[PDB]
Design a protein around this nucleic acid. Structure first.
Length: 110
RNA sequence: AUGUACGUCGCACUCAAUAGUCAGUUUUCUGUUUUUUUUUUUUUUUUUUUUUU
């Protein structure tokens, strides 16, 4: 899956219940070279689905939430300037449509 | 002046009684009194689900 993103502009990964693609796909992005020039967006259907996995990537990468791996849901802007991973639900990115139409804030959206 | 005239009669009530004509299969329901009032205005009733500068 690390090889598919460098060769294709849209990659689709289908996972099962115990797959873990929710927890390792942002880790693939920073390995490829993303995260620096733009933020790594990860769209989730629920905030508690988005919040729980946002603390998970920080704990797996031995950092704290709100720093490099931060989550932005309704007014819970735990985002610093040193961030690369930006967890957010489908409504948050839809709320950022009017602010940024071209989505110049990111480089990889999940 | 003289002489001159008299006798019998009838009526009523009535009036009865008569020609011929034989027969009609068996069985059945229908039937009685009594408490009487016929009618009493009604109520609020349940839940997949999930995301937004």
């Amino acid at each position: 899956i690390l090889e598919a993103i460098r060769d294709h502009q849209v990659v689709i990964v289908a996972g099962e219940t115990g797959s873990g693609k929710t927890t390792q796909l942002p880790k693939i992005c920073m390995e490829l070279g993303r995260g620096i020039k733009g933020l790594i967006g990860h769209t989730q259907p629920r905030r508690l689905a988005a919040r729980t996995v946002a603390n998970r990537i920080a704990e797996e990468l031995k950092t704290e939430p709100g720093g490099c791996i931060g989550y932005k849901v309704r007014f819970s802007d735990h985002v610093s300037d040193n961030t690369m991973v930006k967890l957010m639900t489908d409504g948050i990115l839809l709320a950022e449509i009017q602010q940024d139409r071209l989505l110049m804030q990111y480089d990889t959206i999940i």
